[PDB]
Design a protein around this ligand. Structure first.
Ligand SMILES: [Zn+2]
Ligand SMILES: [Zn+2]
Lengths: 139, 66, 25, 47
């Protein structure tokens, strides 16, 4: 179902806060983003690791140089956080992802995994910034 | 601070003359000929422009942002 | 009265702001 | 869901300062910040 899948989808507007929050390699690793390839076609790639680009690009008022190790089944390459689409998982893209995962041999993540993963986002949103994260943030 | 909108004493709008006043002074009109040329006859209107201290130009030196 | 509707600041994207493509650059 | 927006005294940047939080601008770290204007109805007579 592409509806439950949209609960583990990180729109560009929300991640602007998490661009600097630590534990980043632990919350996003397991979510699915709608990255752009390019004409209006899209592929559901998998957030595997947290990489950094040498290209510092301004993402609205905030600015970022980090990359994202995304991969659509077998085709993996570097990606920047500007090309991700706020569009939800459509049906044709959902089936295309299903065919890219059944063609690669990767197991489909069990629904219970998604249900336990979506709450990580809301608990990270409501995290009290009481520790020394503000100082590393400002640096 | 800023120029009063009306001459307190009589009522003539003097709040549209300050930048004109200063521009005429920059044409090097003498200080009473600037007032004669703006059209301030009564000494009550003239003391609105002569006496006015335009402090808002100093208040605008302070930045809220940028 | 003095109130504000919506009450949901996080993701009112209102589509969006012209998402740039990867294969366009 | 109102996070209590403050305005950095130096940066003039807006800052979200909920309870139990240190006052620092997340831009500068500056320690002084001012509340933004009210949202209520401010009506004057022009008297
Ligand atoms: Zn520093
Ligand atoms: Zn007068």
């Amino acid at each position: 179902l592409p509806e439950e899948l949209n609960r583990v989808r990180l729109s560009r507007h929300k991640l602007e806060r998490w661009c600097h929050m630590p534990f980043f390699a632990k919350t996003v690793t397991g979510c699915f983003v709608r990255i752009g390839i390019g004409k209006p076609v899209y592929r559901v790639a998998e957030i595997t690791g947290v990489v950094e680009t040498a290209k510092v690009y301004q993402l609205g008022g905030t600015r970022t140089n980090k990359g994202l190790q995304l991969r659509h089944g077998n085709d993996q390459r570097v990606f920047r956080l500007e090309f991700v689409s706020n569009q939800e998982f459509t049906e044709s893209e959902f089936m295309k992802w299903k065919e890219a995962m059944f063609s690669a041999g990767m197991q489909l993540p069990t629904l219970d995994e998604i249900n336990k993963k979506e709450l990580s986002i809301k608990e990270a949103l409501n995290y009290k910034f009481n520790d020394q994260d503000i100082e590393e943030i400002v640096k | 601070m800023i120029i009063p909108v009306r001459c307190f004493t009589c009522g003539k709008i003097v709040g549209n003359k300050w930048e004109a006043y200063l521009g005429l002074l920059q044409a090097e009109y003498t200080e009473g000929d600037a007032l004669d040329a703006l059209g301030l006859k009564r000494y009550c209107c003239r003391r609105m422009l002569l006496a006015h201290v335009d402090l808002i130009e100093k208040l605008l030196n302070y930045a809220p942002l940028e | 009265g003095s109130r504000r509707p919506g009450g949901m600041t996080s993701t009112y994207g209102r589509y969006g702001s012209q998402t740039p493509m990867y294969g366009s650059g | 869901q109102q996070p209590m927006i403050y305005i950095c005294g130096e940066c003039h940047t807006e800052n979200e300062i909920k309870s139990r939080d240190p006052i620092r601008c997340r831009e500068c770290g500056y320690r002084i910040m001012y509340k933004k204007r009210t949202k209520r109805l401010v009506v004057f007579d022009a008297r």
